[PDB]
Amino acid sequence: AELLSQQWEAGMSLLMALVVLLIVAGNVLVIAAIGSTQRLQTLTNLFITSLACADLVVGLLVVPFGATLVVRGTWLWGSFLCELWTSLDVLCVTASIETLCVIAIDRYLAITSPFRYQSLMTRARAKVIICTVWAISALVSFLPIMMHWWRDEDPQALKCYQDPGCCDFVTNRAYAIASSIISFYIPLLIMIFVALRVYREAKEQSRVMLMREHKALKTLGIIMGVFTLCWLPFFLVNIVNVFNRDLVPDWLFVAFNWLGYANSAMNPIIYCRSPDFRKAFKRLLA
Template sequence: MENLSVAVTDNTTVLPSGGETGARAPYGGKTLSAAVLVGTFLGIITLGTIIGNVLVCLAAVVNRRLRNITNYFVVSLAVADLLVGVLVLPFSTIFEVTRYWNFGLILCNLWVSLDVLCCTASILNLFAISLDRYYAITRPFTYSNKMCRRKAFMAIAVVWIVSLLVSFLPIWVGWNTEDGRLQNVDDPTQCSFNNTNVPYIMIVAFGTYYIPLIIMCVTYFRIFLIAKEQANRINALQPEVRDANRRQNQNLANEHKATRTLAAVLGAFIICWTPYFTVFTITPLCGCTIPEQLYSVVLWLGYINSLLNPCVYAFMNKEFRRAFKKLLCFQTGNSVCFCNNPRNWGLDTPTTSTAPRQS
């Protein structure tokens, strides 16, 4: 998400040897070696973001064990992160290296709109996931009977519609600027969210970040308390009773594992985006500016979150890890990789699933 109020340092300088005053410094004042280093590092982040989230989407599509209600929201989150990697980060890398926008006003505002869209969609998808987990843990029987694919798709549609309304509509109508004019119309070469009014900042910051974040933290805290209580209750059962309810207990254990993974995703999101939203909220209220380098750090820390999510799935979720290995053909023993034998995905073999009923 681009800056709404941070003043960007002017990239003009006096060139030596009779150069023209006011000419733009190459690479935003960086040396060539520094520009190459920054561009390479950010390019790696961009490429990793694209590859990781493509793997998440493909894994959920081709692996039957990953086709459940919760993972529909996970795929929606991965799509938001993938859009960041494909549509936002390449332009962000170029702008970070050169400190100059050379693609015109329309692409500038389109880039900013997509940035806000994807960030908002990520937050709201995480919010939907937290509610899904809470419902699955606190009311497992009701969840299995009533939560279906159609309801999940409706919730995902609401997430993206709200994200579109928060991003594209205000930016292209001029509702987010102090003077009501189109964003960046005066100087599109310094593409940013400057001249943004405080009401819009407060609505975006609190409506799509702080309030959902507080609810998500409370929700996961409640989930872990309930999960602990359920585990203690199971352990207190007599062995014969525990064996009789083994299937139910296993389903409950699977739900707890999924919740831990998604709580880790939320934790990564908080670490990555809280510094940016702190700057985003405080700067216009105090009327101060921050160093350009500091702003770049907090912005790219937020972008890195789109790279971290697939890493969390690979590290904490056995099914995603197995799917990633097959997609990348990192197979061992007698198994054959997906690109040579699609049967290895289990698409032709019925599998036992703990997923809720889908209709």
């Protein structure tokens, strides 16, 4: 009874810490490698840095908080932080998918108008792009949450809000469909459409130099593919609940949200496809 709980609590704590460590180490490495290697200070890598910040915030704030909820079986932190924590979860996935769109659009430009790209894209503009992405993402994630537009009047929902250790994100149907479409489905569709155009236009192409560029693009394709595979299951289930709560078991819905968090750990590994990152990683770790 109490022993079963102790064994579970301690092993789950150990796993959670590992996940945190992997997400924080991996993404600090990416930021530090870029911050300190002129060869890696390209404009595309400024977008990568932004993605790494999104993932780092998941490692430092989103996951640690969720971990305490999984390990201890209740929300220990009060009402405000529960809402802030929710806000930050929506924020990061929103900022991630929006950044991935930008990366795909940056690459489409560079490949179809290399010279028009040359005269448009500067460090100053890349900064504006990044900031705009985080602005829109903040707008779409915080306000509806601070305006309580997500709340329901279901008996289930009143139960949770009248229980100080409840921090499920029980939402009304309108918000579920709206936030999913606005945070995820639309940027998803744009990203896929643009990523396929980048695929067609890369096909209409020293041989050594073009191979190295296609290796790099494939790496970006992989980042986008893995991100879709990590989050699409959660968002699909999010929709399905609006229509039928029985069609898909609870435990798998929760797990899918954790699969989403897990994506924040994957990008640094995936970047080891690149000689340059690999070398910068090995050098940084001394």
